[PDB]
Ligand binder design. Structure first.
Ligand SMILES: NC(=O)c1ccc[n+]([C@@H]2O[C@H](COP(=O)([O-])OP(=O)(O)OC[C@H]3O[C@@H](n4cnc5c(N)ncnc54)[C@H](OP(=O)(O)O)[C@@H]3O)[C@@H](O)[C@H]2O)c1
Ligand SMILES: NC(=O)c1ccc[n+]([C@@H]2O[C@H](COP(=O)([O-])OP(=O)(O)OC[C@H]3O[C@@H](n4cnc5c(N)ncnc54)[C@H](OP(=O)(O)O)[C@@H]3O)[C@@H](O)[C@H]2O)c1
Ligand SMILES: [Mg+2]
Ligand SMILES: [Mg+2]
Ligand SMILES: [Mg+2]
Ligand SMILES: [Mg+2]
Lengths: 326, 325
């Protein structure tokens, strides 16, 4: 089920030229981890982008997107999902040669049919299960974010060797690579970020913080209890399991966990998770999201403004600004 | 509202002998952080404890609980909350002298009245807002878990100086010390662990993992998606705010966050939080917990067995054992 360093061949990606289109969250992580893994990488950007100089200063070769796509054997598309079909049609498609590989870090555009690649190129994905800044940070610390590896089209007959070697180059074989399909990855990744990692988690910490401040407790106190301490609890779970986190916390807390958890994450919460999954699988969430992107990110940005001005953020920025380290 | 190093005086706790009763999750953290901060510390344990040799090997003075309470000026009680009244009456109370300080790391027993200390001793609390192993790890890395500082009784007239200095000694001034009362700490601490940090968080990750495995996804994939990635998201929030974590994740994920969050943490979840807080404030949760403790921890241990043998735990133990670093 899970593959590690003995299951992959680093030489396969080391023998191919990689073009990373974009330099955002995933783009910088993939480009720098592959550079450090001995791969010939170049980053493709719009002329005059502010990210040009950043990438150059980090030691990477930077060129325009058309040049990166024409030079590369593996073209990895790391611009926002809603932008990829336009960037693909205008700067990538005409430069694909039979025997190149087009790669993604999410299956959204190929699964939902917004990009249809030509027949004589591989279509692969290396999807790190982790946000880009951390895909970079863990690799520099000797660890690595786990990846899902997928092949939609194998024109060379070695697409699997190529995608597994690319996961190696971004740190995935340190923690584990799982083979999956483009539809599986798209659906589980959408579900996780909606239900648990970003949707669920940020609303649970906001609701706790608002319960405490509504009840009269000071917002600095509520930040250190519901928000800052979260990292500490999750660090123990990440390293050593729920059983070790529950051994570290007091018996008072552990009884409280078992009593309160099903009350806060209730039958309705579970039914909402089933409905989240249903709208992912039926394509309705993907259409909602692309509709909002074609309406100037209207919903996204009014929701961004609301959370960025929430009292948990104003209180947290002041607290964090006063931390001192020895 | 928040106090830092310039607001505390390290020399006060450096001038007092501290006795730590117990050596569990908070106990080892307070003993070793105070040792490293230049305080004269001893740990008090039962003769023959398996923790005795671990504390000696870490370089602490270790004695029996009655000797540590007789040697000390500040006696910090870091045994489980349900057993503090018995250890206090049998090994601590008779050794308190006028001018000593009795300290706790949670206000549960003094708030709910299970311990009533004598009149000429200070009664203080330094409550780190973090699990003990991390109170120690952050201090050794040059950071520190923030603390609540409280004074229930000030016999010496300098109990505030002592508790703030003690918070300095365990790393609290690096991140912030807030003054609070014993009632406020007890209520907010019980609420946070039940509603958010331990109850809410573990059931959220369980429910996402079970949704995916019921829907046919493999458990190892559901572990990496719902459980392992959580640390990574929370790290960004801890270091740089929700606005930075939302800048790091894709626009697809950020739209997904804002659409799905209120559906999973719903109006019922919010009403359950307000009920959790009401049973904390009215003492009913405290009595429920102490009744379970007086029944052999029967409910706690059946629920511990059920989560320790959940597929999320069996899958995680096997995944984590194969990490290369
Ligand atoms: N964020 C994550 O951690 C994460 C996790 C796993 C997978 N994914 C997947 O990785 C992929 C990329 O996501 P991301 O979040 O890394 O992207 P991102 O950070 O939002 O992408 C920013 C990059 O796209 C370029 N860009 C933006 N709009 C553009 C346009 N109209 N034309 C040309 N370039 C444009 C930007 O250019 P400038 O530099 O010039 O401003 C920047 O280099 C997506 O498929 C995503 O689902 C993301
Ligand atoms: N856990 C946390 O992170 C946390 C966070 C903040 C505050 N608090 C508060 O800190 C206090 C201590 O909690 P904790 O979780 O650190 O305790 P703990 O780890 O459960 O305490 C274990 C220590 O208590 C001793 N002990 C156990 N039963 C005993 C008995 N019958 N008689 C004598 N000693 C006994 C143990 O002895 P042996 O070593 O001999 O087995 C061990 O040294 C509580 O007030 C708690 O609310 C805890
Ligand atoms: Mg993801
Ligand atoms: Mg995603
Ligand atoms: Mg606490
Ligand atoms: Mg507690």
């Amino acid at each position: 089920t899970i593959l590690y360093e003995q299951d992959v061949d680093p030489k396969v990606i080391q023998g191919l030229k990689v073009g990373i289109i974009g330099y955002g969250s995933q783009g910088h992580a993939h480009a720098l981890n592959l550079m450090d893994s001995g791969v010939d990488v170049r980053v493709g950007l719009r002329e005059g982008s502010s990210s040009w100089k950043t990438a150059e200063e980090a030691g990477l070769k930077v060129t325009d997107m058309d040049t990166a796509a024409e030079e590369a054997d593996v073209i990895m598309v790391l611009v926002p999902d809603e932008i990829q079909p336009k960037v693909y049609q205008e700067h990538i498609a005409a430069h694909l040669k039979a025997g190149n590989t087009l790669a993604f870090a999410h299956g959204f555009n190929i699964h939902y049919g917004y990009i249809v690649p030509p027949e004589d190129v591989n279509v692969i994905m290396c999807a790190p299960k982790g946000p880009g800044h951390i895909v970079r940070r863990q690799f520099t610390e000797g660890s690595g974010v786990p990846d899902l590896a997928c092949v939609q089209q194998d024109a060379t007959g070695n697409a699997w060797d190529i995608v597994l070697s690319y996961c190696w180059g971004v740190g995935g074989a340190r923690s584990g690579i799982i083979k999956a399909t483009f539809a599986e990855e798209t659906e589980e990744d959408l579900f996780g970020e909606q239900a648990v990692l970003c949707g669920g988690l940020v609303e649970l910490v906001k609701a706790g913080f608002e319960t405490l401040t509504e009840a009269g407790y000071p917002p600095e106190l509520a930040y250190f209890e519901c928000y800052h301490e979260m990292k500490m609890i999750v660090d123990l779970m990440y390293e050593s399991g729920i059983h070790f986190m529950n051994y570290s916390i007091s018996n008072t807390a552990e009884y409280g966990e078992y009593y309160a958890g099903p009350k806060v994450i209730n039958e309705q919460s579970r039914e909402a998770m089933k409905e989240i999954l249903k709208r992912i699988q039926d394509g309705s969430f993907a259409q909602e999201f692309v509709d909002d992107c074609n309406n100037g990110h209207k919903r996204l940005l009014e929701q961004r403004e609301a959370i960025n001005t929430h009292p948990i953020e104003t209180t947290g920025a002041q607290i964090r600004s006063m931390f001192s380290w020895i």
